[PDB]
Coordinates of C-alpha atoms in Angstrom, one line a residue:
Chain X
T162 CA 247.1 205.7 95.0
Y163 CA 243.4 206.5 94.4
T164 CA 241.7 205.2 91.3
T165 CA 239.4 206.7 88.6
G166 CA 236.9 205.1 86.2
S167 CA 233.4 204.6 85.0
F168 CA 231.1 202.1 86.8
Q169 CA 227.5 200.9 87.1
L170 CA 225.5 200.1 90.2
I171 CA 222.8 197.5 90.7
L194 CA 221.7 210.5 92.9
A195 CA 221.0 212.6 96.1
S196 CA 222.9 215.9 96.1
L197 CA 226.3 217.4 97.0
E198 CA 226.3 220.3 99.4
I199 CA 224.1 223.1 98.0
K200 CA 226.3 224.4 95.2
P201 CA 228.5 222.6 92.6
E202 CA 232.2 223.1 92.6
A203 CA 233.1 226.5 91.0
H204 CA 236.5 227.2 89.5
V205 CA 238.1 229.8 87.2
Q206 CA 241.3 230.1 85.3
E207 CA 243.1 232.7 83.1
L208 CA 244.9 232.7 79.7
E209 CA 247.1 235.3 78.0
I210 CA 246.2 235.1 74.3
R211 CA 248.5 236.7 71.7
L212 CA 247.0 238.1 68.5
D213 CA 249.6 238.5 65.7
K214 CA 249.7 238.5 61.9
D215 CA 249.7 234.7 61.8
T216 CA 247.0 234.4 64.5
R217 CA 243.9 236.5 64.1
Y218 CA 241.5 233.9 65.7
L219 CA 241.6 231.4 68.6
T220 CA 239.3 228.8 70.0
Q221 CA 239.5 226.8 73.3
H222 CA 237.5 223.7 74.2
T223 CA 236.0 222.9 77.6
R224 CA 234.7 220.0 79.7
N225 CA 231.3 218.2 79.9
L226 CA 229.6 220.9 81.9
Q227 CA 226.9 218.7 83.7
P228 CA 223.4 220.2 83.4
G229 CA 222.8 223.2 85.6
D230 CA 226.4 224.4 85.4
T231 CA 227.0 228.0 84.4
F232 CA 229.9 229.2 82.3
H233 CA 231.4 232.8 82.5
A234 CA 233.9 234.3 80.1
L235 CA 235.5 237.8 80.1
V236 CA 238.4 239.0 77.9
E237 CA 240.1 242.4 78.5
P238 CA 243.0 244.1 76.8
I239 CA 246.3 244.8 78.6
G240 CA 248.6 246.8 76.4
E241 CA 246.0 248.5 74.3
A242 CA 242.2 248.6 73.6
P243 CA 241.5 246.5 70.5
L244 CA 238.5 244.8 72.1
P245 CA 238.5 241.4 70.3
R246 CA 235.0 239.9 70.0
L247 CA 234.0 236.7 71.9
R248 CA 231.6 233.9 71.1
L249 CA 230.6 230.6 72.6
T250 CA 229.6 227.6 70.5
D251 CA 229.1 223.8 70.9
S252 CA 231.4 221.0 69.7
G253 CA 230.3 221.4 66.1
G254 CA 230.3 225.2 66.1
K255 CA 226.6 225.9 66.5
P256 CA 226.1 229.2 68.4
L257 CA 225.2 229.1 72.0
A258 CA 226.2 232.5 73.4
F259 CA 227.2 235.9 72.0
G260 CA 229.2 238.7 73.5
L261 CA 227.8 242.0 74.8
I262 CA 230.1 244.8 75.9
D263 CA 229.5 246.0 79.5
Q264 CA 228.5 249.6 80.3
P265 CA 231.9 250.4 81.8
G266 CA 234.7 250.8 79.3
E267 CA 236.9 247.9 78.3
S268 CA 236.5 244.2 79.1
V269 CA 233.6 242.0 77.9
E270 CA 231.2 239.6 79.7
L271 CA 229.6 236.4 78.5
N272 CA 227.4 234.0 80.4
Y273 CA 225.7 230.8 79.5
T274 CA 223.8 228.1 81.4
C275 CA 223.5 224.7 79.7
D276 CA 220.3 222.6 79.3
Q277 CA 221.7 219.2 78.2
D278 CA 224.1 216.8 79.8
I279 CA 227.6 216.1 78.3
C280 CA 227.8 219.3 76.2
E281 CA 231.2 220.6 75.1
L282 CA 231.7 224.3 74.7
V283 CA 234.2 226.1 72.6
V284 CA 235.1 229.8 73.3
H285 CA 236.0 231.9 70.2
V286 CA 238.1 235.1 70.3
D287 CA 238.4 237.0 67.0
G288 CA 239.1 240.5 65.7
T289 CA 236.9 240.0 62.7
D290 CA 236.0 243.7 62.5
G291 CA 239.5 244.7 63.7
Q292 CA 241.5 243.2 60.9
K293 CA 244.0 246.2 60.9
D294 CA 247.5 245.0 61.4
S295 CA 250.0 246.9 63.5
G296 CA 251.7 244.3 65.7
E297 CA 251.4 241.6 68.3
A298 CA 248.9 242.2 71.1
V299 CA 248.1 240.5 74.4
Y300 CA 244.7 239.9 76.0
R301 CA 243.8 238.5 79.4
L302 CA 240.9 236.0 79.2
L303 CA 239.2 234.9 82.4
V304 CA 237.1 231.7 82.0
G305 CA 235.2 230.1 84.9
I306 CA 232.6 227.4 85.5
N307 CA 229.9 227.5 88.2
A308 CA 231.5 230.7 89.5
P309 CA 229.4 233.9 89.2
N310 CA 232.4 236.0 90.3
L311 CA 232.7 239.3 88.5
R312 CA 236.5 239.0 88.3
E313 CA 239.3 236.6 89.3
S314 CA 239.0 237.5 93.0
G315 CA 241.0 234.8 94.9
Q316 CA 241.8 231.1 94.9
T317 CA 242.2 231.1 91.1
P318 CA 244.6 228.1 90.9
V319 CA 243.0 226.1 93.7
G320 CA 240.3 224.9 91.3
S321 CA 240.6 222.6 88.3
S322 CA 241.3 223.8 84.8
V323 CA 238.2 224.6 82.8
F324 CA 239.8 224.3 79.3
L325 CA 240.6 221.0 77.6
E326 CA 244.4 220.6 78.0
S327 CA 246.5 219.0 75.3
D328 CA 248.1 215.7 76.4
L329 CA 251.8 215.7 77.4
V330 CA 254.1 213.2 75.7
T331 CA 257.8 212.8 76.4
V332 CA 259.9 211.7 73.4
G333 CA 263.4 210.3 73.3
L334 CA 265.5 209.5 70.3
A335 CA 268.9 207.8 70.2
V336 CA 271.1 206.9 67.2
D337 CA 272.9 203.6 67.3
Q338 CA 274.9 204.2 64.1
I339 CA 274.7 206.0 60.8
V340 CA 274.1 203.1 58.3
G341 CA 275.0 205.1 55.2
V342 CA 274.9 208.3 53.3
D343 CA 273.8 208.6 49.7
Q344 CA 275.3 211.9 48.5
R345 CA 273.7 211.9 45.0
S346 CA 270.1 211.5 45.9
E347 CA 270.8 213.4 49.1
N348 CA 269.6 211.0 51.8
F349 CA 271.0 209.1 54.7
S350 CA 270.1 205.8 56.4
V351 CA 270.2 205.7 60.2
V352 CA 269.4 203.1 62.8
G353 CA 268.3 203.9 66.3
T354 CA 265.7 203.7 69.0
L355 CA 262.6 205.9 69.6
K356 CA 260.7 206.1 72.9
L357 CA 257.4 207.8 73.6
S358 CA 255.7 208.2 77.0
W359 CA 252.4 209.8 77.8
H360 CA 249.6 209.5 80.4
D361 CA 246.1 209.1 79.0
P362 CA 243.8 207.7 81.8
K363 CA 241.2 206.7 79.1
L364 CA 243.7 203.9 78.3
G365 CA 243.4 202.7 81.9
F366 CA 242.0 199.4 83.0
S367 CA 241.3 197.5 86.2
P368 CA 243.9 194.8 86.9
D369 CA 241.2 192.6 88.4
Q370 CA 240.0 191.4 85.0
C371 CA 243.3 190.9 83.1
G372 CA 245.2 189.9 86.2
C373 CA 248.3 191.7 85.2
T374 CA 249.8 195.2 85.8
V375 CA 250.7 195.9 82.1
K376 CA 248.8 195.6 78.8
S377 CA 251.1 194.9 75.8
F378 CA 250.7 195.6 72.1
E379 CA 253.4 194.1 69.9
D380 CA 254.4 194.4 66.2
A381 CA 251.8 197.2 65.6
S382 CA 252.3 200.9 65.2
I383 CA 250.5 203.5 67.2
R384 CA 248.1 204.0 64.3
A385 CA 247.1 200.4 64.3
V386 CA 246.5 200.1 68.1
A387 CA 244.6 203.4 67.9
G388 CA 242.4 201.9 65.2
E389 CA 241.8 198.7 67.2
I390 CA 241.1 200.6 70.5
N391 CA 239.3 203.6 68.9
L392 CA 240.8 206.1 71.2
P393 CA 243.2 209.0 70.3
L394 CA 246.9 208.1 70.6
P395 CA 250.1 210.1 69.7
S396 CA 250.8 208.6 66.4
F397 CA 254.0 210.0 64.8
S398 CA 255.9 209.8 61.5
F399 CA 259.4 210.4 60.4
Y400 CA 259.0 213.6 58.3
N401 CA 261.6 212.9 55.6
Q402 CA 261.2 209.2 55.5
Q403 CA 261.9 207.5 52.2
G404 CA 260.3 204.1 51.6
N405 CA 259.2 201.8 54.4
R406 CA 260.8 202.1 57.8
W407 CA 262.2 198.9 59.2
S408 CA 260.8 198.6 62.8
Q409 CA 261.6 196.0 65.3
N410 CA 261.0 195.5 69.1
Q411 CA 257.9 197.6 68.4
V412 CA 256.0 197.6 71.7
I413 CA 253.4 199.6 73.6
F414 CA 253.0 199.2 77.4
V415 CA 249.9 200.5 79.2
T416 CA 249.5 200.6 82.9
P417 CA 246.2 200.9 84.9
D418 CA 247.2 204.4 86.0
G419 CA 247.1 205.5 82.4
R420 CA 250.8 205.6 81.8
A421 CA 251.5 204.5 78.2
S422 CA 254.9 203.9 76.6
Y423 CA 255.9 203.1 73.0
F424 CA 259.3 201.7 72.1
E425 CA 260.7 201.0 68.6
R426 CA 264.1 200.2 67.0
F427 CA 264.1 201.7 63.6
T428 CA 266.2 201.5 60.4
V429 CA 265.0 204.5 58.4
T430 CA 266.3 206.2 55.2
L431 CA 265.6 209.9 55.6
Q432 CA 265.7 212.3 52.7
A433 CA 268.1 215.2 53.4
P434 CA 267.4 218.3 51.2
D435 CA 270.0 220.4 53.0
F436 CA 273.2 218.5 51.9
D437 CA 275.7 221.1 50.8
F438 CA 278.7 219.2 49.2
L439 CA 280.3 222.4 47.8
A440 CA 283.2 222.2 50.2
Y441 CA 283.8 218.4 49.9
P442 CA 285.8 216.8 51.5
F443 CA 285.9 219.6 54.0
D444 CA 282.1 220.1 54.2
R445 CA 280.3 219.6 57.4
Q446 CA 276.8 218.3 57.2
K447 CA 273.7 218.4 59.4
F448 CA 271.8 215.1 59.7
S449 CA 268.3 216.1 60.8
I450 CA 266.0 213.4 62.1
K451 CA 262.5 214.9 62.5
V452 CA 259.7 213.1 64.2
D453 CA 256.3 214.8 63.6
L454 CA 253.3 214.1 65.7
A455 CA 250.5 213.1 63.4
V456 CA 247.8 214.6 65.7
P457 CA 247.2 218.3 66.1
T458 CA 248.7 220.5 68.9
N459 CA 245.3 220.7 70.7
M460 CA 245.4 216.9 71.2
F461 CA 249.1 216.0 71.9
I462 CA 252.3 218.0 72.3
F463 CA 255.9 216.9 72.7
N464 CA 256.6 218.2 76.2
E465 CA 260.1 217.2 77.1
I466 CA 263.0 215.1 75.9
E467 CA 264.0 211.8 77.5
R468 CA 267.7 211.1 77.7
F469 CA 267.2 207.4 78.3
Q470 CA 270.5 206.7 76.6
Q471 CA 273.3 208.5 74.9
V472 CA 272.3 210.1 71.6
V473 CA 275.3 209.5 69.3
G474 CA 276.4 206.2 71.0
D475 CA 279.8 204.5 71.0
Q476 CA 281.1 202.4 68.2
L477 CA 284.2 200.2 67.9
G478 CA 286.5 201.2 65.0
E479 CA 286.7 204.3 62.9
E480 CA 283.8 205.8 61.0
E481 CA 283.2 207.7 57.7
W482 CA 281.1 210.4 59.4
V483 CA 282.0 211.5 62.9
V484 CA 279.4 213.4 65.0
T485 CA 280.9 216.7 66.2
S486 CA 277.8 217.6 68.2
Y487 CA 274.1 216.8 68.6
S488 CA 271.0 218.8 69.5
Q489 CA 267.5 217.6 70.3
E490 CA 264.8 220.2 70.3
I491 CA 261.1 220.5 70.2
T492 CA 259.1 222.9 68.1
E493 CA 255.6 223.3 66.6
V494 CA 255.0 223.5 62.8
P495 CA 251.9 224.1 60.8
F496 CA 249.6 221.1 60.2
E497 CA 247.1 220.2 57.5
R498 CA 243.7 221.8 57.9
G499 CA 244.8 224.7 60.1
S500 CA 246.5 224.6 63.5
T501 CA 250.0 223.1 64.2
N502 CA 251.5 219.8 65.4
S503 CA 254.6 219.2 67.5
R504 CA 257.9 218.2 66.0
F505 CA 260.9 216.6 67.7
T506 CA 264.2 217.3 65.8
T507 CA 267.5 215.6 66.5
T508 CA 270.3 217.3 64.6
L509 CA 273.7 215.6 64.3
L510 CA 276.6 217.8 63.2
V511 CA 278.7 215.3 61.2
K512 CA 282.1 215.8 59.7
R513 CA 284.2 213.7 57.3
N514 CA 287.5 212.1 58.2
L515 CA 290.1 214.8 57.1
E516 CA 293.1 212.5 57.6
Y517 CA 291.8 210.1 55.0
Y518 CA 291.5 212.8 52.3
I519 CA 294.6 214.7 53.3
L520 CA 296.9 211.6 53.2
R521 CA 295.3 209.7 50.4
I522 CA 294.7 212.6 48.0
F523 CA 296.5 215.8 48.9
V524 CA 300.0 214.5 49.8
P525 CA 300.4 212.4 46.7
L526 CA 299.0 215.3 44.6
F527 CA 301.5 217.6 46.3
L528 CA 304.4 215.3 45.4
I529 CA 303.1 214.9 41.8
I530 CA 303.0 218.7 41.4
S531 CA 306.3 219.0 43.2
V532 CA 308.1 216.8 40.6
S533 CA 306.7 219.0 37.8
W534 CA 308.0 222.0 39.7
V535 CA 311.4 220.6 40.2
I536 CA 312.0 219.5 36.6
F537 CA 312.8 223.2 35.8
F538 CA 316.2 223.0 37.4
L539 CA 317.3 220.8 34.5
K540 CA 318.9 222.6 31.6
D541 CA 318.5 219.6 29.3
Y542 CA 315.1 220.5 27.9
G543 CA 314.7 217.2 26.1
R544 CA 314.8 215.3 29.4
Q545 CA 312.7 218.1 30.9
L546 CA 310.0 217.8 28.2
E547 CA 309.9 214.0 28.4
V548 CA 309.7 214.0 32.2
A549 CA 306.9 216.7 32.0
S550 CA 304.9 214.6 29.6
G551 CA 305.4 211.5 31.7
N552 CA 304.4 213.4 34.8
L553 CA 301.2 214.7 33.2
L554 CA 300.3 211.1 32.3
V555 CA 301.1 210.2 36.0
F556 CA 298.8 213.0 37.1
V557 CA 296.0 211.7 34.9
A558 CA 296.5 208.1 36.2
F559 CA 296.5 209.2 39.8
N560 CA 293.5 211.5 39.1
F561 CA 291.5 208.6 38.1
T562 CA 293.0 206.2 40.7
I563 CA 291.2 208.5 43.2
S564 CA 287.8 208.2 41.6
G565 CA 285.8 206.3 44.2
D566 CA 286.2 208.7 47.1
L567 CA 285.4 211.5 44.7
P568 CA 281.6 211.3 44.3
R569 CA 279.8 211.6 41.0
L570 CA 277.8 214.7 41.8
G571 CA 276.6 216.8 38.9
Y572 CA 278.3 220.0 40.0
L573 CA 281.7 221.1 41.0
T574 CA 283.6 220.7 44.3
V575 CA 286.6 222.4 45.9
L576 CA 288.5 219.2 45.5
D577 CA 287.4 219.0 41.9
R578 CA 288.4 222.6 41.4
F579 CA 291.8 222.0 42.9
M580 CA 292.3 218.9 40.7
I581 CA 291.3 220.9 37.6
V582 CA 293.7 223.7 38.4
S583 CA 296.6 221.4 39.1
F584 CA 295.9 219.5 35.8
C585 CA 295.9 222.8 33.9
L586 CA 299.2 223.8 35.5
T587 CA 300.7 220.5 34.5
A588 CA 299.5 221.0 31.0
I589 CA 301.1 224.5 31.1
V590 CA 304.4 223.0 32.3
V591 CA 304.4 220.7 29.4
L592 CA 303.7 223.6 27.0
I593 CA 306.5 225.7 28.6
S594 CA 308.9 222.7 28.3
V595 CA 308.1 222.5 24.6
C596 CA 308.7 226.2 24.2
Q597 CA 311.9 226.1 26.1
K598 CA 313.2 223.2 24.0
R599 CA 312.3 225.2 20.9
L600 CA 314.2 228.3 22.2
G601 CA 317.2 226.2 23.1
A602 CA 317.2 224.7 19.6
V603 CA 317.1 228.2 18.1
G604 CA 320.0 229.3 20.3
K605 CA 318.4 231.5 22.9
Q606 CA 319.5 229.6 26.0
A607 CA 319.6 232.7 28.2
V608 CA 315.9 233.4 27.8
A609 CA 315.2 229.7 28.4
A610 CA 317.1 229.9 31.7
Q611 CA 315.2 233.1 32.5
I612 CA 311.9 231.3 31.9
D613 CA 313.1 228.4 34.1
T614 CA 313.9 230.7 37.0
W615 CA 310.7 232.7 36.6
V616 CA 308.5 229.6 36.6
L617 CA 310.4 228.2 39.6
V618 CA 309.2 231.1 41.6
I619 CA 305.7 231.8 40.1
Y620 CA 304.5 228.2 40.2
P621 CA 304.4 227.9 44.1
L622 CA 303.1 231.5 44.2
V623 CA 300.2 230.6 41.9
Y624 CA 299.4 227.4 43.9
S625 CA 299.4 229.4 47.2
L626 CA 297.3 232.1 45.7
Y627 CA 294.8 229.6 44.4
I628 CA 294.6 227.8 47.8
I629 CA 294.0 231.1 49.6
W630 CA 291.4 232.1 47.0
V631 CA 289.4 228.9 47.4
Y632 CA 289.7 229.2 51.2
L633 CA 288.2 232.7 51.0
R634 CA 285.6 231.6 48.5
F635 CA 284.2 228.5 50.2
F636 CA 285.3 228.7 53.9
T637 CA 284.7 232.3 54.8
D638 CA 283.1 235.5 53.7
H639 CA 284.1 237.4 50.5
Chain P
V483 CA 287.3 181.6 57.5
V484 CA 286.0 180.9 61.0
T485 CA 288.9 180.6 63.4
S486 CA 286.6 179.7 66.3
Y487 CA 283.0 179.9 67.5
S488 CA 281.3 180.4 70.9
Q489 CA 277.6 180.0 71.8
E490 CA 276.6 181.5 75.1
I491 CA 273.4 182.5 77.0
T492 CA 273.0 185.7 78.9
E493 CA 270.2 187.9 80.2
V494 CA 269.8 191.5 79.1
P495 CA 267.4 194.3 80.1
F496 CA 263.9 194.3 78.6
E497 CA 261.4 197.0 77.9
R498 CA 259.2 197.9 80.8
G499 CA 261.6 196.6 83.5
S500 CA 263.0 193.1 84.0
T501 CA 265.2 191.2 81.6
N502 CA 265.0 188.7 78.8
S503 CA 267.2 185.9 77.7
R504 CA 269.7 186.2 74.9
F505 CA 271.5 183.5 72.9
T506 CA 274.6 184.7 71.2
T507 CA 276.7 182.8 68.6
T508 CA 280.0 184.6 68.0
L509 CA 282.1 183.6 65.0
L510 CA 285.8 184.7 65.0
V511 CA 286.3 185.2 61.3
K512 CA 289.5 186.0 59.5
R513 CA 290.4 187.0 56.0
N514 CA 292.5 185.0 53.5
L515 CA 296.0 186.3 54.1
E516 CA 297.5 184.4 51.2
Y517 CA 295.3 186.3 48.7
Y518 CA 296.3 189.7 50.0
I519 CA 300.0 188.7 50.5
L520 CA 300.4 187.3 47.0
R521 CA 298.1 189.6 45.0
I522 CA 299.1 192.9 46.6
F523 CA 302.2 192.7 48.7
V524 CA 304.6 190.7 46.5
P525 CA 303.9 192.8 43.3
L526 CA 304.2 196.0 45.4
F527 CA 307.5 194.7 46.9
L528 CA 308.9 194.1 43.3
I529 CA 307.6 197.6 42.2
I530 CA 309.4 199.3 45.0
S531 CA 312.5 197.0 44.6
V532 CA 313.0 198.2 41.0
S533 CA 312.8 201.8 42.2
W534 CA 315.4 200.9 44.8
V535 CA 317.7 199.1 42.3
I536 CA 317.7 202.0 39.8
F537 CA 320.2 203.8 42.0
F538 CA 323.1 201.5 40.9
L539 CA 323.0 203.2 37.5
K540 CA 325.4 206.2 37.1
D541 CA 323.5 207.3 33.9
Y542 CA 321.1 209.6 35.6
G543 CA 319.1 210.2 32.5
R544 CA 318.2 206.6 32.3
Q545 CA 317.7 206.6 36.0
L546 CA 315.3 209.5 35.8
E547 CA 313.3 208.0 33.0
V548 CA 313.0 204.6 34.7
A549 CA 312.0 206.3 37.9
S550 CA 309.2 208.2 36.2
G551 CA 308.1 205.1 34.3
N552 CA 308.1 203.1 37.6
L553 CA 306.0 205.8 39.3
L554 CA 303.5 205.5 36.5
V555 CA 303.7 201.7 36.9
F556 CA 303.0 202.1 40.7
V557 CA 299.9 204.2 40.0
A558 CA 298.6 201.8 37.4
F559 CA 299.0 198.8 39.8
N560 CA 297.7 200.9 42.7
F561 CA 294.4 201.3 40.8
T562 CA 294.5 197.7 39.4
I563 CA 294.1 196.6 43.0
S564 CA 291.0 198.7 43.6
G565 CA 288.3 196.1 44.1
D566 CA 289.8 194.2 47.0
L567 CA 290.6 197.6 48.6
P568 CA 287.2 198.7 49.9
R569 CA 285.7 202.1 49.6
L570 CA 285.5 202.9 53.3
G571 CA 285.6 206.5 54.4
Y572 CA 288.6 206.2 56.6
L573 CA 292.2 205.0 56.4
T574 CA 293.5 201.4 56.6
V575 CA 296.9 199.9 57.3
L576 CA 297.0 198.7 53.6
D577 CA 296.0 202.2 52.6
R578 CA 298.7 203.7 54.8
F579 CA 301.3 201.4 53.3
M580 CA 300.3 202.3 49.8
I581 CA 300.4 206.0 50.5
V582 CA 303.9 205.7 52.1
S583 CA 305.2 203.7 49.2
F584 CA 303.8 206.1 46.6
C585 CA 305.4 209.0 48.5
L586 CA 308.7 207.2 48.5
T587 CA 308.5 206.6 44.7
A588 CA 307.7 210.3 44.3
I589 CA 310.8 211.1 46.4
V590 CA 312.9 208.7 44.3
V591 CA 311.8 210.6 41.2
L592 CA 312.7 213.9 42.9
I593 CA 316.1 212.6 43.9
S594 CA 316.7 211.3 40.4
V595 CA 316.0 214.8 39.0
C596 CA 318.4 216.4 41.6
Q597 CA 321.1 213.9 40.8
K598 CA 320.8 214.5 37.1
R599 CA 321.1 218.2 37.8
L600 CA 324.2 217.7 39.9
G601 CA 325.8 215.5 37.3
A602 CA 325.1 218.2 34.7
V603 CA 326.7 220.8 36.9
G604 CA 329.8 218.6 37.4
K605 CA 329.4 217.3 40.9
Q606 CA 329.4 213.6 40.1
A607 CA 331.0 212.6 43.4
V608 CA 328.2 214.0 45.5
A609 CA 325.7 212.3 43.2
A610 CA 327.4 208.9 43.8
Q611 CA 327.3 209.7 47.5
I612 CA 323.6 210.3 47.3
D613 CA 323.2 207.1 45.3
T614 CA 324.9 205.0 48.0
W615 CA 323.1 206.8 50.8
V616 CA 319.7 206.2 49.4
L617 CA 320.6 202.6 48.6
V618 CA 320.9 202.0 52.3
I619 CA 318.3 204.3 53.8
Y620 CA 315.5 203.2 51.5
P621 CA 315.2 199.7 52.9
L622 CA 315.8 201.0 56.3
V623 CA 312.9 203.5 56.0
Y624 CA 310.6 200.8 54.6
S625 CA 311.5 198.4 57.5
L626 CA 311.1 201.1 60.1
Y627 CA 307.6 202.0 58.7
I628 CA 306.6 198.3 58.7
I629 CA 307.7 197.9 62.3
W630 CA 305.9 201.2 63.3
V631 CA 302.6 200.2 61.7
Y632 CA 302.9 196.7 63.3
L633 CA 303.4 198.4 66.7
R634 CA 300.6 200.9 66.1
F635 CA 297.9 198.6 64.9
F636 CA 298.8 195.0 66.0
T637 CA 300.1 195.5 69.5
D638 CA 300.3 198.1 72.4
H639 CA 302.1 201.4 72.2

């Protein structure tokens, strides 16, 4: 491969004209974007810069300007004699001067909808329009650096359902190509430069060059990082590797359907630098995301999705965000067998005591079974979590407890009626409850299914 | 308690190509089986044995009341042993055994209710038949479940 760098020697000229090259950009003006700026290269002295925006789908005619790095004006925009399109030209007088082109509908603040404009920007090219060989030349705008990010989850360390957070351990890999990080292997005598036990912010501080520092968006407390390493190659390729144990705050935990609720564990990694500097380009599948574990697990990952977006950043603009969403589900066998089958038997005995016509024994068994219900209710008190609101399991337990209280009450009333002498009505009540009790239970089950697991 | 140990040296892939050495010390640890056998399994065996032995009684009122009291006893002991049992989010062979035993005690309460009803009707012979049938199928069911869980979790198939 060829090599690039800055050197010194212990002038002449190139042909008769400097290299000239132009590019295009489709800029979208919307409600959330009424202004745009684009940065350029050094523009060695004597180079000329030409800009021209035109409207495609309408004629809003957004104004153009050209400023320096700090925003001091260098060139204004004058509309041409023919209709539509604008022309801007500027020739520099100092070396290493950066230019920023501004497009703005400052006077056209009326809002109707999104609009598209075609902007042609060229350097050293006096061409009136694009003409030909547009992509053969180099890009004139400063392009955001491309970084590939990969996240894998070794295991879900824990879930705290009251403070709504979850602790996860995994590995994070970043990989970009910034030639300013490059070096000549002649001096160091090695093909890799290594930084260890230091975050990207620290190495950026001790190198004083921009680097794609990141952060876990919903991190609580100090992340536990190990195997933290940064490898840099002479060709500018840089890679960051970290193995992290992090407690992430999850404000989207919906435990209303517990233990049938399905949760979304979102691990968001936000780039700490603006979009104009670095962007998450693609996702590296260096290893499986969920991973394989031996033995069962409290939370099982139904599916996963890694996806890259852009979200607003402090002081204007946006930054990239890499989100890994895990669709986790509880172990339904555990709650079905440990809770629901014993509860079904406990309510079934209270149902079956109505066949007895000895209402003294019926009453005593009903009271004993209500005590049994309470004892089992609190036996299952660890899996049931101490949230401050109700839960479909909690609602079911409350309803079943109320029905057992009602069976005790009905047993008392039936014994009273038998003592009075109205045994026929007591038998009628027996046979009525024998059929309405399962009906009430089934109706409540259907109602809670409709209320929490579907619409209406 | 550490049954055995093994220290061994391998090489595993390293970041940015190549490998690095790894020194692994594996300890084969085992739980104290006497603690769980005596604290949990013997009391549970006695608690299920009383529910088994109440079928010899032909006074089904006393049988029913003892069955309900023993189910309450089972629940109380079930939660008395709640510290050693760990709050994992999935099932466990101990948890499965406790669930099955609880279900069988619920079934003995149900059968006691049905037998008292049959005795009240006048069909005492069928109630005695049910008594002698459960007296032999209850230990058979327990033994079959023990063998099944042994096959499922402690060997192949």
